[PDB]
Amino acid sequence: YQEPTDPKFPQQWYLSGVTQRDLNVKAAWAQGYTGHGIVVSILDDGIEKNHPDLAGNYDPGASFDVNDQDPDPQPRYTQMNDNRHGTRCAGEVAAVANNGVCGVGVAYNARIGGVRMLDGEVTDAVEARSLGLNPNHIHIYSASWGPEDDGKTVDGPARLAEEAFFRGVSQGRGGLGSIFVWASGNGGREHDSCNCDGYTNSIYTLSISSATQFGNVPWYSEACSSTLATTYSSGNQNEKQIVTTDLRQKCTESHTGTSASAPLAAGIIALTLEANKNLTWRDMQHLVVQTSKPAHLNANDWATNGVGRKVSHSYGYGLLDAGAMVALAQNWTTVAPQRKCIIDILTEPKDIGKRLEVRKTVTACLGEPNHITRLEHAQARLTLSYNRRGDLAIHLVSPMGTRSTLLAARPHDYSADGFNDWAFMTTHSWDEDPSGEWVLEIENTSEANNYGTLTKFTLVLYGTASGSLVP
Ligand SMILES: CC(=O)NC[C@H]1CC[N@H+](Cc2cc(Oc3ccc(N4CC[NH+](CCC(=O)[O-])CC4)nc3)nc(-c3cc(Cl)cc(Cl)c3)c2)CC1
Ligand SMILES: *[C@@H]1O[C@H](CO)[C@@H](O)[C@H](O)[C@H]1NC(C)=O
Ligand SMILES: [Ca+2]
Ligand SMILES: [Ca+2]
Ligand SMILES: [Ca+2]
Ligand SMILES: [Cl-]
Ligand code: NA
Ligand code: NA
Ligand code: NA
Ligand code: NA
């Protein structure tokens, strides 16, 4: 195998490293996987389809302009170099290799397109038309953004966008399911807590956070239980950044944020789908859980779950490992159909006050076709009132003892609107048996005399009852 000759490939340290601080992509390329036959779309502010490092891989069938209602996602050029972000992300996935220009994509033989959706008013219809673009042609969608990362917003897909997620995972990709890759957010300096973003908090999105070059949690990272894994991105000014294609037929060495991590994950997922085109949207999440690597990622919250895997709210299961992903994909056995076990927990509404603990022992639908002995995602769908939402911290403990933070205190969230059936999601109990005692903790983290009531707690378990591996 011959590594790329592109002039900036040596600067793509997260691919080209010799010292084990990388995504192990060369190992996948050397197994023969480069993304050939896979189609990825960047949901962002447009794509410069004529960029010298994108044109050779550009796919009009992966592209649309939902802001101006036309097929051509070319960016709107301005003095301030607005509308460059989609082009940067596209190159991360699929910049052409061995052509003397910039660097390379993770999946440098994949086809790449973009949806111009963020350069205008983003409505539910705009989102649904983007997530639902050409779902039997596009395999993987990469989205780096969502509701405002101000540390005070709780929002997620409205009805059309949610319907687009379920149509995508159910009928998309010939019934195997569209793969939606999401960035978990850039709200770290606002103390944002990413389960409050319903896009990354969705089970249907494969959510990705960031690590800096020296293996630390970047300033912009949001912690939450819904994240599944990590890719490298930017950090402090002594740490390198992401090197990729830029608007106006240029390169950049200064692409940054969690919004630069999701495209790298989308590229790795593209290599993995080349290795086994029959993988379902759930299979892909299983592969990420099993192959991601905590080693050398620094966080104070690494915890071992009930099946012996280390998990963090900053990093999920750790750094994606492309060589391991493609290797495990090749002989992967499709997971069993997805079951869903619904447990309405409360017998009466519960005053929250300073602290509330709710304990319930469940059988996880014993005796039913939705009996789950092998969990995937779990949700605590909560309906509660509270006088100052951001003073709440919420945790969920599984029968195996795994303590998932569903919500951390958000100092800027002054809302008095509470949570209206908000489906807080955790990936940290993946592969555990969910039968037994679950514990929900709601705490007022402030010294103020705050008040409210929990009126509904639905525990929703997804998973199967077959196929488990030794812890
Ligand atoms: C009841 C109802 O009907 N409720 C409609 C709401 C539902 C919630 N939704 C949240 C949402 C806002 C948003 O708003 C934006 C707008 C602009 C940006 N930008 C533009 C500038 N960029 C500069 C970067 C740089 O230059 O480096 C940064 C990002 N981000 C988020 N997007 C998304 C979103 C993003 C992607 Cl990707 C894919 C999908 Cl599906 C949805 C979602 C808004 C409509
Ligand atoms: C894909 O997986 C399904 C489910 O296991 C199986 O029925 C089908 O034969 C597989 N198709 C290919 C082409 O491997
Ligand atoms: Ca256009
Ligand atoms: Ca190149
Ligand atoms: Ca956020
Ligand atoms: Cl469902
Ligand atoms: Na965000
Ligand atoms: Na997700
Ligand atoms: Na444990
Ligand atoms: Na149990």
UniProtKB/Swiss-Prot annotation:
Seems to be expressed ubiquitously. It comes from Homo sapiens (Human). The active site is at 44 (charge relay system), 85 (charge relay system), 259 (charge relay system). It is an enzyme of class 3 (hydrolase). The keyword Transmembrane helix applies. This is Furin. Optimum pH is 6.0. Ca(2+) 3 binds at residues 149, 192, 222. It is a single-pass type I membrane protein. Belongs to the peptidase S8 family. Furin subfamily. Residues 12-326 form the Peptidase S8 domain. The gene is FURIN. Substrate binds at residues 45, 82-83, 127, 144-149, 155, 183-186, 197, 199, 259. Ubiquitous endoprotease within constitutive secretory pathways capable of cleavage at the RX(K/R)R consensus motif. Mediates processing of TGFB1, an essential step in TGF-beta-1 activation. Converts through proteolytic cleavage the non-functional Brain natriuretic factor prohormone into its active hormone BNP(1-32). By mediating processing of accessory subunit ATP6AP1/Ac45 of the V-ATPase, regulates the acidification of dense-core secretory granules in islets of Langerhans cells. (Microbial infection) Cleaves and activates diphtheria toxin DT. Ca(2+) 1 binds at residues 6, 53, 96, 99, 101, 103. The inhibition peptide, which plays the role of an intramolecular chaperone, is autocatalytically removed in the endoplasmic reticulum (ER) and remains non-covalently bound to furin as a potent autoinhibitor. Following transport to the trans Golgi, a second cleavage within the inhibition propeptide results in propeptide dissociation and furin activation. Phosphorylation is required for TGN localization of the endoprotease. In vivo, exists as di-, mono- and non-phosphorylated forms. Its main location: Golgi. Residues 53-74 are annotated as: Disordered. Glycans are attached at residues 278, 331, 444.
